[model samples]
Target: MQYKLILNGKTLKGETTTEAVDAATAEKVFKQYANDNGVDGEWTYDDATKTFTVTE
Candidate 1:
């Protein structure tokens, strides 16, 4: 599944064919960026769009 990490309505990171699917999986991807960088928020996976979006 494709994944995108967004922070505060802005796209912080994104790519194609990521392993993130569920909330836990999505959290890992989000945390990787959130931990290293200054980003964190609630996230959801859209099956139709196949996008993992986060809002802070």
Candidate 2:
């Protein structure tokens, strides 16, 4: 229910934990969006969309 590594303005292309950290849009707002809160979703959370989609 809380966090990912790190991302920034000029360093938006960097990778962490072998995973893509594309949170440049929510730099200080990462904790509100990090995944692994549950075992749901056939749909995925995309980098383009900044929201936890709970659609089935």
Candidate 3:
């Protein structure tokens, strides 16, 4: 499956694009970025749209 990570209502640095075999993997990858970036906002996944949004 394909997933996108959005930060502060916009895509993060780099490609801001990625793919995972499953939803769990996708969340794990997203969380990694949140941790690394010290993100304090919340993130949500829209399975229907395959978009991850992080908001403050």
**Predicted structure with the largest TM-score when compared to the true one:** 3
Q: Tell me the tens digit of each residue's lDDT in model 3 across 1-56.
A: 67777777344443277656877876886688677876536777687888876665
Runs in model 2 deviating more than 4 A are 1-43
- Model 2 clash pairs are none
Give all TM-scores, in the order shown. Answer: 0.45, 0.20, 0.63
Looking at candidate 2, the ten consecutive residues that score lowest on lDDT are: 6-15
Instruction: Quantify all predictions' global Cα lDDT against the true fold.
Output: 0.58, 0.35, 0.68
Candidate with maximal lDDT:
3
- Residue 36 accuracy (lDDT) in model 2: 40
Residue 48 miss distance in model 2 (angstroms): 0.7
User: Candidate 2 lDDT, tens digit per residue, 1-56?
Assistant: 22234332232322243234544444324433433432232333445433333222
Please write out the lDDT profile of model 1 over residues 1-56, one tens digit for every residue.
Answer: 44554456355554435554575666675578665776556766576775555565
Candidate 1 differs from the real structure by a C-alpha RMSD in angstroms, to one decimal, of 4.1
